[PDB]
């Protein structure tokens with residue numbers, strides 16, 4: 001088991017061509033709808049299916065079978081992305097191909113900056129057999145724009161875009177620490193394309209750059225890809241009855 | 253559950269104890285009977301802890317379990333282990349130690365030594381040792397000063413550049429934001445500059461412990477580093493000779 005070392009999922013993300021990635025919120029989207037969606041994501045050629053939410057409860061019982069249902073519907077890697085909780089670390093279920101581990105470098109709480117990683121690894125392997133664990137994608141996670149929800153939960157402070165001083169410190173850490181990926185997120189605004197470009201230029205060639213938050217159109221996906229993103233995530237755009245139309249346009 | 257990476261009894265002692273010298277015994281060089289003699293004197297001098305440390309080691313567990321037990325039987329001071337990690341194993345550990353000092357080599361060009369050694373170590377926990385019996389972990393930023401091809405070849409470190417404070421300021425932002433417990437400034441072949449010690453003391457939080465070591469052989473040097481803000485001044489080599497009791501009195505006096 002690679003665990004924190006590069007594995008199959010990271011290799012796939014590094015080698016696949018850049019593009020959109022749909023994020024299914026498993027605590028909002030019924031499993032039957034996730035399964036329908038998963039079949040389309042495969043046809044569209046996305047690199048992976050992310051299951052992610054800021055909120056969760058009864059994680060293991062809900063997610064082990066949710067992950068299994070999704071994997072029965074798509075051959076694409078299923079990657080989990082959820083915040084950690086003191087006393088438990090990051091949530092995990094057997095069957096997931098990988099867990100995205102966000103180190104919230106802009107947080108004022110050292111638990112969310114990185115000690116969550118120590119609690120998670122201490123608890124490993126736990127109830128899940130060693131060879132069956134998901135791979136761990138070590139990720140620098142940064143938040144943009146006003147966001148009191150993530151701020152109250154995780155201690156994050158919006159990254160300053162007044163200059164490159166803060167961002168450059170995060171790039172030095174991303175590189176020296178050997179992180180696998182950088183995830184740029186905005187809950188309420190949009191990550192600036194200029195920031196995406198700055199990150200693509202400052203990161204090593206094998207470091208994967210994800211951007212998400214309020215992406216609702218194919219034009220936005222193209223703009224972020226043109227700015228250097230490897231993957232552009234989107235969740236909310238498909239949380240409605242007419243999601244097939246929306247998905248076609250965002251991917252089109 | 254064991255405090256592990258959370259602050260525990262050893263960190264509280266290091267935070268609260270009067271600043272001063274700390275003798276470091278290299279257990280792979282110093283015979284255990286001599287370590288026990290030394291431990292008794294360290295206790296009388298009221299040092300904060302006894303560090304057992306070496307750059308080199310082999311057969312760690314069979315050598316160190318009884319060595320640590322002998323030293324613990326000779327002093328009530330906490331016994332702290334400090335050794336480099338090895339890929340595939342992480343940091344070495346034995347039961348009975350009070351704490352392991354975990355160095356994150358922020359100046360290394362190898363990400364394993366920068367911090368992935370911590371992930372390998374915690375993944376392996378609890379391993380062969382019962383959870384309640386594990387040592388506490390002191391999360392430490394470790395930096396090297398001066399030419400040192402030995403640590404460079406072994407761990408990938410590059411000497412910290414003091415031509416500006418840019419590099420150390422980035423390490424201080426990490427030490428603070430990541431909530432490290434301690435910072436360890438080391439020079440294998442030279443001396444950490446007292447002005448760098450002052451820079452770190454001024455930039456760290458009040459609860460972050462600052463250790464300096466490397467070629468400390470006189471009481472004057474200990475005083476200069478304490479005056480500069482070091483919480484602890486480590487010294488090993490000065491006592492690796494027959495006349496160590498005289499050397500110890502001069503360094504601690």
Ligand SMILES: CC(C)=CCC/C(C)=C/CC/C(C)=C\CO[C@H](COP(=O)(O)O)C(=O)O
Pocket residue numbers: 023052053054081082083084102104141142143150183184185187212213214215233234235236237
């Ligand atoms: C803060 C952070 C990056 C990591 C900490 C862990 C954490 C809070 C993980 C949850 C996943 C996440 C970052 C945001 C939630 O929704 C968006 C899609 O947004 P849209 O509906 O606008 O398309 C997504 O999953 O990307």
Ligand SMILES: CC(C)=CCC/C(C)=C/CC/C(C)=C\CO[C@H](COP(=O)(O)O)C(=O)O
Pocket residue numbers: 276305306307334335336337355394395396403436437438440465466467468486487488489490
């Ligand atoms: C490079 C680093 C700080 C950590 C990585 C792990 C590592 C190499 C740990 C071994 C302990 C160490 C840092 C130096 C060895 O001797 C000195 C004192 O020297 P003196 O004989 O000159 O008094 C000591 O133990 O401090």
Ligand SMILES: [Mg+2]
Pocket residue numbers: 121122123124125374375376377378
């Ligand atoms: Mg473990």
